[PDB]
């Protein structure tokens, strides 16, 4: 026994499990595919796939308090740190075939396990590069409505700013997942998130900040707008 319903956000869904409990999900962009080794089910004519909050980290922010969800079908988005598609498979489900996803990853064997999946998921483009060197993909993408970042690197607040210079449109939105022990592991994490708080507010308008406990450890997320 399972059932499926819509969420409050466009393209986002809820599944009902065999006790009656509610869990978050999306409509599969390519039915029959498994995308990150996940739970997938069929409903009225269509196929639906689980959003795991531990593995597809943005899902923990959706449960803990995210209001500012800027993406829609038919929009353009840049994704930094696409890995093997764990989080970004859910934006590929939401953005549809008229919409555009550019996916950047540095780690070649991690992106290599996404290349066969995007041989079917042709709304994602796989791009090999360090997001700290954004000039090395300047010719491979358009301007965009939204940026997401999941690379979780020691200077990642600057990565979001300089990609928002090169690629984000006027009034466009930014989203970022922050891993404290990449930036510092000796101090209190709220001091690390205070250094991210003061850098994002040196170039953006800030509209969301969150915690991913208990689904993650030492981990936050923010949402911003470009002027």
């Amino acid at each position: 026994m399972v059932e499926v319903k819509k969420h409050k956000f466009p393209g986002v869904y809820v599944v009902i499990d065999d006790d009656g409990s509610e869990k978050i999900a999306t409509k599969n962009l390519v039915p029959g595919q498994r995308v990150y080794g996940e739970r997938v089910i069929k409903w009225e004519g269509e196929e639906y796939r689980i959003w795991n909050p531990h593995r597809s980290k943005l899902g923990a922010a959706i449960v803990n308090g995210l209001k500012n969800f800027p993406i829609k079908p038919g929009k353009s988005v840049l994704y930094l740190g696409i890995a093997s598609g764990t989080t970004a498979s859910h934006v590929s489900d939401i953005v549809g075939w008229e919409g555009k996803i550019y996916g950047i990853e540095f780690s070649p064997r991690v992106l290599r396990e996404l290349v066969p999946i995007v041989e079917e998921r042709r709304n994602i483009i796989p791009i090999l590069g360090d997001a700290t060197k954004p000039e090395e993909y300047r010719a491979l993408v358009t301007k965009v409505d939204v940026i997401f970042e999941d690379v979780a690197q020691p200077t990642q607040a600057k990565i979001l700013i300089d990609n928002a210079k090169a690629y984000l449109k006027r009034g466009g939105y930014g989203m970022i997942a922050v891993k404290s022990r990449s930036i510092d592991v000796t101090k209190e994490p709220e001091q690390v998130f205070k250094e991210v708080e003061r850098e994002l507010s040196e170039y953006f308008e800030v509209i969301e900040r969150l915690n991913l406990e208990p689904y993650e450890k030492d981990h936050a997320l923010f949402v911003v707008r470009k002027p």
Partner: peptide, 14 residues
């Protein structure tokens, strides 16, 4: 599995 999703280790190639 909880640690594999968040590890602070470096990268060794295949």
């Amino acid at each position: 599995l909880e640690a594999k999703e968040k590890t602070m280790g470096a990268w060794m190639d295949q």
